[model samples]
Target: WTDQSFIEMMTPHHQDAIDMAEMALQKAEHPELKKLARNIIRDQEREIKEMKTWYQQWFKRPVPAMDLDALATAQNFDREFIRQMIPHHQMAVMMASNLKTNTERPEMDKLMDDIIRSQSAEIKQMKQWYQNWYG
Candidate 1:
């Protein structure tokens, strides 16, 4: 697929993930999960802005609806939320890898590297917290 496809897929799909993370912040009573959710929101929100510019260059249109009034709220704020976010983070990592491999520019490389390192570390941290929550 072209870069356009990558951006288009990434832009709104990321928003869904961000929305989930933010929901975790809103819903999780656990302090660590709340903190992790805030981190996801903080980090991904920045990536969303950066990706928006790239999306404009790629597709010349406003981003699609990542509208999220519809997801089933996780019944419990622990495993369910973590399970959802794990895949979300994984997808972001995959998209970052695409950006890393495809871009030749230094700035783009740095951006991808930042995304990978930040999100991947937070992912591990989130998993550790999630597990410890059960222990």
Candidate 2:
């Protein structure tokens, strides 16, 4: 897919992430998980704004609103948040990985690199936490 497609797709993906993180902020049992949720909200919100600006500047159009699927409910909020977020972050990593080489813009390249690196590390950390907490 092109850089424009990546931006359009990822903007909603980041929004989904922020929504999940907001749930964790309110409902997470673990303090650490809540802290991580805050971090996700902070970082992804910043990224969304950045991507929106880029989209406006590059395409001369507003990014369209996307319909997001509702998050599934779980009895254990902490466990569920971790379970859902690991794969969520993994998808972002995969998306960024695909776009890394396809983009002409150095800015997109750098953003993809940041997404890949940060989300990969977060996936690993979430896996460990899941194992420790649930298994």
Best by TM-score: 2
List lDDT for all candidates, in order. Answer: 0.71, 0.83
Q: Per-residue alpha-carbon lDDT of model 2 for 68-127, expressed as tens digits?
A: 233345677777777678888989999999998788898899899889988888888788
Residue 11 lDDT in candidate 1: 69
TM-score per candidate, chains pooled: 0.79, 0.92
How high is the lDDT of residue 102 in model 1? 79
Candidate closest to the true structure, highest lDDT: 2
Clashes in model 2: which pairs? none
The local lDDT score (0 to 100) that residue 67 gets in candidate 2 is 17
- Pairs with backbone N, CA or C atoms under 3 Å apart (clashes), candidate 1: none
